[PDB]
Amino acid sequence: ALRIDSHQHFWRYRAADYPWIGAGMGVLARDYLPDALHPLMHAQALGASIAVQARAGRDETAFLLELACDEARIAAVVGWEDLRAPQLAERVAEWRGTKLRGFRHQLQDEADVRAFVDDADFARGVAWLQANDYVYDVLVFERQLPDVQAFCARHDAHWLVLDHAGKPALAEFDRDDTALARWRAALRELAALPHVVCKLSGLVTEADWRRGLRASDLRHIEQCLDAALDAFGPQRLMFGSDWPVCLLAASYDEVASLVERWAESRLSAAERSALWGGTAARCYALP
Ligand SMILES: [Zn+2]
Numbered sequence: 385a386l387r388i389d390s391h392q393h394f395w396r397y398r399a400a401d402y403p404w405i406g407a408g409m410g411v412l413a414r415d416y417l418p419d420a421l422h423p424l425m426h427a428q429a430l431g432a433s434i435a436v437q438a439r440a441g442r443d444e445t446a447f448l449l450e451l452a453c454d455e456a457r458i459a460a461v462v463g464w465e466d467l468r469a470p471q472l473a474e475r476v477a478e479w480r481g482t483k484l485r486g487f488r489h490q491l492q493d494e495a496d497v498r499a500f501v502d503d504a505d506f507a508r509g510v511a512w513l514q515a516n517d518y519v520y521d522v523l524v525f526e527r528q529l530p531d532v533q534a535f536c537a538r539h540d541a542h543w544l545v546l547d548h549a550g551k552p553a554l555a556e557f558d559r560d561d562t563a564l565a566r567w568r569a570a571l572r573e574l575a576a577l578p579h580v581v582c583k584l585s586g587l588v589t590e591a592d593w594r595r596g597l598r599a600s601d602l603r604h605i606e607q608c609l610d611a612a613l614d615a616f617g618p619q620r621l622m623f624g625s626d627w628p629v630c631l632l633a634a635s636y637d638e639v640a641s642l643v644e645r646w647a648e649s650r651l652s653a654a655e656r657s658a659l660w661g662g663t664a665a666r667c668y669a670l671p
Contacts, residue, residue: 386670388459388661389425389433391547391585391624394418394451401439404493408594409632416628418451418458424627424636425457430660432459434624434668436521437488440464445479452483460485460668462521467509476516485668486519486545497528501535514541519668522580523547526563529570540579543667548586548626549612550574555592557604564604568611575615581667582616584609584643584659585624593633602642609646618655622663 395402396415405412425433435448435458445463452458460483465475467489476484494500501507513520522544524532529550536544550571556563574580587608591601612621623643630639647656664670 385657386432386459386661386665387428387430388623388664388670389428389430389625389627390622390661390664390668391436391583392421392433392627393438393629394421394435394448395438404490411631412628418455421627422457424625427637428640430640432457432670434458434460434462434485434664436462437464440490442466442475445484449479449482449484458483459670462486462488462519464488465509467513468503468505469509470505472509472512484518485670486521487513488521488523488547490523491532492524492528492551497524498531501532507535507538510539511541514539517542517669519543519545521545521547522550525551526553526567526570529567529574533570533573536574536577536580540577542579544577544580545622545667546574546580546582548590549582549584549608551586551590552608554587554590554601554604554608557607558600564607564611567608568615571611572615575617575620581620581622581663582612583622583624584612585622585639586626586629588630588633588639588642589626591633597633605642606646609643610650613650618651619658619663621659622667623660624664 394417397413435452437444441464448461452461463484465472465487491497510520522532552567553563587605588597591597625636625639627636647659651659
């Protein structure tokens with residue numbers, strides 16, 4: 385049974401190439417390469433990871449597949465391509481036979497997410513992806529969930545992965561007694577689509593990490609894990625670390641531990657096996 389970290393990044397850091405790494409994020413402002421990741425995975429008995437594009441450009445795809453090309457502990461890559469580009473197929477051919485299993489665009493940084501996903505060219509690209517058994521990772525903020533609802537429903541030919549459980553606004557759970565409710569309604573609406581699955585990752589960094597993770601953040605996170613379980617069911621949940629991004633808020637070990645303690649509480653042995661690699665294996669077509 386594969387044990388998979390379904391969501392991590394790599395980079396040789398250069399400030400202008402990673403606009404999302406800004407002020408107060410100095411911990412991220414350095415290289416993060418497979419060698420730093422292996423001991424972390426080893427400590428959690430995770431045998432392989434999935435490398436996910438951390439910036440927009442084909443060279444990011446090339447870079448990740450280069451790291452992946454001949455490294456057993458990287459099982460798959462989620463790349464980046466211009467999905468609106470008419471030459472999509474030709475471009476993806478360069479990656480034939482490799483561990484490329486899917487694509488992601490950083491939708492959360494789009495100004496009109498809805499206009500972006502409902503675009504005729506982008507839709508063509510995604511439909512082509514699905515026709516070729518490519519996964520598409522959905523990365524949006526909680527408030528953008530309704531903007532991608534219709535998009536997810538129309539692209540039902542292959543698996544869509546909701547990154548970071550759709551980023552609940554955990555920092556607001558105590559100020560805004562509608563934050564949890566709003567996210568849950570949106571989550572449930574997506575989960576009702578059979579071809580959509582859910583990553584349990586990226587939650588420590590939706591809390592107020594700048595001021596520091598508190599015990600109450602861990603409880604809200606558990607609330608989100610429970611909501612995700614209820615909406616998606618135990619067979620559509622996928623552990624990911626979101627390393628190295630998670631280092632803003634918590635260690636790799638802490639990230640894995642809180643999901644583990646939660647899973648031992650709520651899931652059977654078999655369901656845990658799905659959470660810790662089985663679901664990622666089947667959705668990303670892993671050996
Ligand atoms: Zn190779």
